[PDB]
DNA sequence: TCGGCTTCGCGC
DNA sequence: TGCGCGAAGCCGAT
């Protein structure tokens with residue numbers, strides 16, 4: 001649909017129909033940003049072709065009640081900065097509240113929309129909203145992959161088993177899809193308050209907060225400043241200060257050598273393609289550049305491939321055949337320890353390293369990547385059943401992680417607990433053939449003592 | 457029908 | 469600290 005620096009493989013028609021005479025509505029959801037947004041840039045191209053304005057809509061769902069203050073305040077503060085950014089380009093933003101299956105369908109008919117466009121997300125709750133809006137509208141409905149560099153439906157046509165089967169497929173399409181972004185043109189035709197949704201949003205989640213003994217809450221919101229502008233600063237500080245020694249200090253949680261980009265990448269406050277653009281042009285360690293590109297391109301986009309082609313990505317059914325047979329054969333094995341969800345949540349286990357990992361999760365909202373594997377694997381070893389292990393790990397992840405409720409989370413937890421995108425290993429107690437990670441293995445990799453004392 | 461796929465453990 | 473190095477399945481160029 002028109003344009004030259006616009007790859008049509010990023011667009012796919014979700015429903016046919018006659019193009020209305022009204023404005024193009026962009027149902028933004030996953031990629032909350034003004035710049036470097038294919039879904040917003042595509043909506044402008046269709047809007048410019050029909051001589052209609054482009055409008056952005058956002059439907060705040062009732063699923064923030066399963067997500068606390070740390071994820072609500074991080075999202076809402078970025079939406080307030082986004083509203084000012086879109087207003088500078090004369091693009092109005094409308095913020096709705098309720099079921100998107102009924103609010104979006106009511107919004108298009110009331111505003112007399114001509115074409116509806118939205119971003120891509122492989123989550124189950126998004127596929128239900130889409131089908132509910134297709135049966136309630138009469139205008140064409142388009143969908144853009146603005147999160148992945150290579151469109152999810154174009155990178156692979158099936159669920160990829162491991163990373164070595166997905167790496168040559170992704171890198172073969174890189175010269176075509178890795179491109180610069182055109183500047184968002186402003187509107188030529190101008191035609192709820194967020195401060196109130198934030199006040200009414202926190203007061204409902206105040207009782208469900210994580211507090212210490214003296215009613216002192218555990219979350220430290222000064223570690224990550226939300227917003228599109230702040231997300232660019234974290235990227236700039238990563239390339240100049242942390243990219244050189246990233247390839248060597250990536251498995252050391254005592255060194256702040258990660259990009260710290262996942263909270264902005266999950267909420268779409270920064271484009272992963274823009275990060276790859278700047279990383280590919282920077283002169284750093286070739287081992288560190290290949291190590292970082294392999295995380296934000298291969299592992300990040302294979303998680304979308306895992307959730308898009310496996311509807312039960314958060315269940316035991318999505319595990320490989322060799323894993324399910326191994327975990328079922330070790331269901332009657334005697335567990336050395338058994339902890340409930342409340343014991344895992346408060347970090348009241350016998351392992352000081354695991355408790356230190358959980359304390360970093362509760363206090364900073366972003367637990368180190370290497371400790372996240374030790375964190376989720378110890379849950380499987382100290383639980384009643386593999387089904388309970390998956391339930392506790394997903395619950396604690398999507399509640400305190402700033403990057404929670406993300407395909408990277410479900411695919412990461414499935415990698416540690418169900419061996420997805422991995423292979424079998426030494427046969428062991430309880431965990432069977434799933435890869436085991438011990439306290440002593442982390443002691444030789446990094447100063448474990450420094451990690452415990454930092455988080456009690 | 458082999459090949460070498462990490463974010464492993466553990467011994468120089 | 470790098471470097472080996474067993475121990476286990478299923479994919480993919482054949």
Ligand SMILES: Cc1cc2nc3c(=O)[nH]c(=O)nc-3n(C[C@H](O)[C@H](O)[C@H](O)COP(=O)(O)OP(=O)(O)OC[C@H]3O[C@@H](n4cnc5c(N)ncnc54)[C@H](O)[C@@H]3O)c2cc1C
Nearest residue numbers: 258259260261262295296299300369376403404408409412
């Ligand atoms: C049990 C478990 C749970 C996780 N929970 C989440 C989660 O809820 N949300 C989330 O976005 N990621 C999660 N991760 C992936 C990974 O832990 C985080 O991406 C990473 O820790 C975030 O910090 P970073 O961006 O500074 O890491 P970096 O080394 O700087 O990587 C940058 C980006 O690459 C991506 N990435 C890196 N590693 C992975 C990976 N193993 N899988 C998928 N993407 C990756 C991330 O998007 C990340 O933002 C989880 C992994 C595991 C094993």
